[PDB]
Amino acid sequence: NMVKVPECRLADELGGLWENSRFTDCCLCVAGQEFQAHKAILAARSPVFSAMFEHEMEESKKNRVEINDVEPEVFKEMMCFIYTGKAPNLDKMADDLLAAADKYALERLKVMCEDALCSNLSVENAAEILILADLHSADQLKTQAVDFINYHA
Amino acid sequence: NMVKVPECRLADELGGLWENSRFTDCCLCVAGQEFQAHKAILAARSPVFSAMFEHEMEESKKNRVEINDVEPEVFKEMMCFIYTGKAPNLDKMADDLLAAADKYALERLKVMCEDALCSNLSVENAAEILILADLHSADQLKTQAVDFINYHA
């Protein structure tokens, strides 16, 4: 225990990779905005992206994937999660991020959003959150939501 | 604290990326053996690979990088570290990995080897390890090797 070993920095460096966009091989177009990314990473991280890049006929697309169901700011948080496993701005978009994580099968990000939404459960938004968990198959969130509503009988 | 969030699995998934060799864009030839890899990840993880891929005039090289100064088994451990930040078999090759980590500027891996070597310091091997740390710029290893030798008077 004499030698001081530095903290793992895989996440920070992969984040650098995404921020610097080097050796990118695909373009994601989100509401008219273009983002360069790396197929290998997105595929190893999302079963949806994986399937998309693995079974895409029509070179006409030219590695150009157009995303229509996600707002640019939410998209960026999702990407941040894919490259580093973190989502610094999750708190202010938990519900939209949940839907994006669900759509792109990012299980851990999905549960992280569930965790944040659960923590904000109130009698004013209990029902809405409950419905939200049903539309994006967020089990843990639903259960905690049902329990909440019941308890407040 | 009601929702149970899974542990980050960035490393595991990036390891799968390397083990499955999907969407690779380069080839590393090591002592006759070929390994497919991803430029972006090697580049974001190693200043040497970074500079190598960033400045390579020969198309003739074809993203084909040949490594002559590293044994295949050691090379694989290095790659494992580059993709996941771990080196499960570092103990049986600490000295060789140290040199390989040094040559490719993998700072953290270099210190990890320094920690293993430092822990095996014995009257019998002390002198050999000290020299090893000087030839591969392993500062912490050196300082610990010099002290050991002194204390044993």
Side-chain angles (χ1 to χ4, degrees), chain A residues 1-123 125-153, chain B residues 1-61 63-153:
Chain A
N1 64 303
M2 288 301 102
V3 179
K4 285 174 183 166
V5 182
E7 163 177 49
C8 176
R9 48 166 63 182
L10 180 69
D12 301 314
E13 299 197 298
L14 289 168
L17 181 50
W18 159 248
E19 294 292 325
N20 297 311
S21 302
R22 296 201 167 184
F23 309 94
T24 59
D25 52 8
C26 65
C27 177
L28 299 175
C29 316
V30 189
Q33 293 186 54
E34 285 173 34
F35 302 84
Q36 300 303 294
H38 317 258
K39 286 181 174 185
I41 297 176
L42 298 189
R45 209 83 171 118
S46 163
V48 176
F49 274 135
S50 180
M52 195 178 77
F53 294 137
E54 205 75 55
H55 313 299
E56 172 52 26
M57 242 99 234
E58 305 306 306
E59 172 166 307
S60 28
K61 297 293 184 175
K62 293 178 232 295
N63 311 288
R64 200 159 179 292
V65 181
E66 67 178 55
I67 303 185
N68 306 299
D69 64 304
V70 184
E71 276 173 50
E73 202 181 327
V74 180
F75 177 76
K76 289 172 201 170
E77 198 62 28
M78 180 173 80
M79 286 301 102
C80 174
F81 175 78
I82 286 183
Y83 286 73
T84 74
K86 297 169 179 163
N89 315 298
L90 168 44
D91 291 310
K92 72 170 184 176
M93 56 175 81
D95 64 328
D96 294 309
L97 196 52
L98 182 64
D102 174 51
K103 201 293 177 186
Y104 292 80
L106 299 172
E107 193 50 48
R108 174 158 176 280
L109 174 58
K110 186 176 178 174
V111 171
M112 286 169 95
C113 291
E114 291 181 68
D115 177 52
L117 289 169
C118 183
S119 296
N120 287 308
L121 267 170
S122 76
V123 169
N125 60 34
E128 174 177 49
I129 284 180
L130 169 55
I131 290 180
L132 183 61
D134 296 325
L135 302 172
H136 307 302
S137 49
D139 301 330
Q140 289 198 58
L141 178 66
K142 176 185 182 174
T143 298
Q144 297 304 302
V146 169
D147 291 10
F148 186 85
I149 300 178
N150 287 324
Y151 186 75
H152 295 291
Chain B
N1 67 300
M2 292 294 93
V3 181
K4 283 175 181 169
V5 178
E7 56 180 57
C8 172
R9 56 191 199 177
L10 180 66
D12 300 321
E13 304 207 303
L14 287 171
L17 186 38
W18 160 250
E19 293 289 324
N20 300 309
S21 286
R22 190 53 71 178
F23 309 96
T24 61
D25 50 13
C26 66
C27 176
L28 302 177
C29 188
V30 190
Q33 290 179 56
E34 277 175 43
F35 309 84
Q36 297 301 305
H38 316 66
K39 286 182 176 189
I41 299 169
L42 292 194
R45 209 90 166 113
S46 159
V48 180
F49 276 133
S50 183
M52 195 178 80
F53 292 136
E54 206 69 61
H55 317 296
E56 175 47 48
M57 305 257 139
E58 301 306 299
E59 161 68 47
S60 21
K61 296 225 171 151
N63 309 296
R64 190 186 176 75
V65 182
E66 66 181 63
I67 304 180
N68 321 302
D69 67 304
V70 183
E71 274 173 52
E73 174 161 31
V74 179
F75 173 82
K76 290 174 198 169
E77 197 62 35
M78 182 174 79
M79 287 298 100
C80 172
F81 171 81
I82 284 177
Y83 283 75
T84 71
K86 303 169 180 168
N89 312 301
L90 154 31
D91 295 316
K92 77 177 195 178
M93 55 174 93
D95 56 348
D96 296 312
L97 194 50
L98 176 63
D102 173 52
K103 161 108 175 190
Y104 289 82
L106 294 175
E107 197 50 52
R108 177 156 172 284
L109 180 57
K110 185 174 183 177
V111 167
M112 280 165 86
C113 293
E114 290 182 66
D115 185 45
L117 292 171
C118 183
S119 301
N120 297 321
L121 274 175
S122 73
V123 172
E124 186 280 355
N125 67 36
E128 298 173 347
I129 289 177
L130 171 54
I131 292 181
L132 184 59
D134 296 315
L135 305 175
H136 305 303
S137 302
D139 301 335
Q140 290 195 60
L141 180 59
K142 172 176 184 177
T143 294
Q144 295 298 301
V146 168
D147 296 348
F148 183 84
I149 291 178
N150 291 319
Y151 181 77
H152 287 300

